[PDB]
UniProtKB/Swiss-Prot annotation:
The lineage of its organism: Bacteria, Bacillati, Actinomycetota, Actinomycetes, Kitasatosporales. It is found in: Secreted. One of its GO terms (cellular component) is extracellular region. The active site is at residue 62. SUPFAM superfamilies: beta-lactamase/transpeptidase-like. It comes from Streptomyces sp. (strain R61). This is D-alanyl-D-alanine carboxypeptidase. Coiled coil: none annotated.
């Protein structure tokens, strides 16, 4: 159908509120069927004072899961992967249970324990512990495997980064290439995403970027600059770098059917219930807005960056919002409101 007009005054209010709650800077870009809405408030670097802008590059965190899912779904289109085959069929001896399938891994129904629960029990100390470390995919899987599974295979939704570390391992095993090459050839290049990179384990963000500021667990604590890290603890689960325009392009292309067959795009949208207003398909989230429309995309949290990248069912309207802080739930909940303003419009 047709959407209400985006509410720029509402978006402006959301950004201003995020700043009052602790975000150094916040921005949002809406690509509304060819008409751009772009707003930003605050600083990209709180020490030097440089203002944040919608062209600043940033770490997308978990949104990386959708890029991984797209590559895997293309491998299904090519006949190289079967979603219902066991993970152990492709990676022998990896998982303790042969019944855990690729589909379950992609929709977070595998029961694999999330190793980040151990890594980041304490926010800043955990970040300091892993920021300069380089892990192999096996290293992370092993960390997960020290714990038992949380549920029977396919039995329930339980978000776990381990699932997309397994995804990265699958892509590399099946294609014989690194995940960086696969993202480049299958997505970045075709869509011409010039602000999008996967540089793991490099710690530098190429070009003009917003710095990320990690909020400490203790109320009132000083912010920690968490911009430069290897993100090796996430890799195919969260190390992509992009911009508001590139993520809008990517989700619009995805929902309009340009990245895989119609059959695989329907598979990706087979929703597993997360809560009363959300669903998870295969590396894709569905959020149900107040005005009765659902949007599709992914959220991302990586140290110092909160990202919301969602598009309408047909991809005609896409929105990417970013606040350069993390471990601040107020900012997190506030930033979600950009979706309401951008898609539902003025109240």
């Amino acid at each position: 159908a047709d959407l209400p007009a985006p509410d720029d005054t509402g978006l402006q209010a959301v950004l201003h509120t995020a700043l009052s709650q602790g975000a150094p800077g916040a921005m949002v870009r809406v690509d509304d069927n060819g008409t751009i809405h772009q707003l930003s408030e605050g600083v990209a670097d709180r020490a030097t004072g440089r203002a944040i802008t919608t062209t600043d590059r940033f770490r997308v965190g978990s949104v990386t899961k959708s890029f991984s899912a797209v590559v895997l779904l293309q491998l299904v289109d090519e006949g190289k992967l079967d979603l219902d085959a066991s993970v152990n069929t492709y990676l022998p001896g990896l998982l303790p249970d042969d019944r855990i399938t690729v589909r379950q891994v992609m929709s977070h129904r595998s029961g694999l324990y999330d190793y980040t629960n151990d890594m980041f029990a304490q926010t800043v100390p955990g970040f300091e512990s892993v920021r300069n470390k380089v892990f192999s995919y096996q290293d992370l899987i092993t960390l997960s495997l020290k714990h038992g599974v949380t549920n029977a295979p396919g039995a329930a939704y339980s978000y776990s980064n381990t699932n997309f570390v397994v995804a990265g391992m699958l892509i590399e095993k099946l294609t014989g290439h690194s995940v960086a090459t696969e993202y480049q050839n299958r997505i970045f290049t075709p869509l011409n995403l010039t602000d999008t990179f996967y540089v793991h384990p490099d710690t530098v963000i190429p070009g003009t970027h917003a710095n990320g500021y990690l909020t400490p667990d203790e109320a009132g604590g000083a912010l920690v600059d968490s911009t430069e890290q290897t993100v090796s603890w996430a890799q195919s689960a969260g190390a992509v770098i992009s911009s508001t325009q590139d993520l809008d392009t990517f989700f619009s292309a995805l929902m309009s059917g340009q990245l895989m067959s119609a059959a695989q795009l329907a598979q990706m949208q087979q929703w597993t219930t997360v809560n009363s207003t959300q669903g998870y398909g295969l590396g894709l989230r569905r959020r149900d807005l107040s005005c009765g429309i659902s949007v599709y995309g992914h959220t991302g949290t990586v140290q110092g960056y909160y990202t919301y990248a969602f598009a309408s069912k047909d991809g005609k309207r896409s929105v990417t919002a970013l606040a350069n802080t993390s471990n601040n739930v107020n900012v997190l909940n506030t930033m979600a409101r950009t979706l309401e303003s951008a898609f539902c419009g003025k109240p």
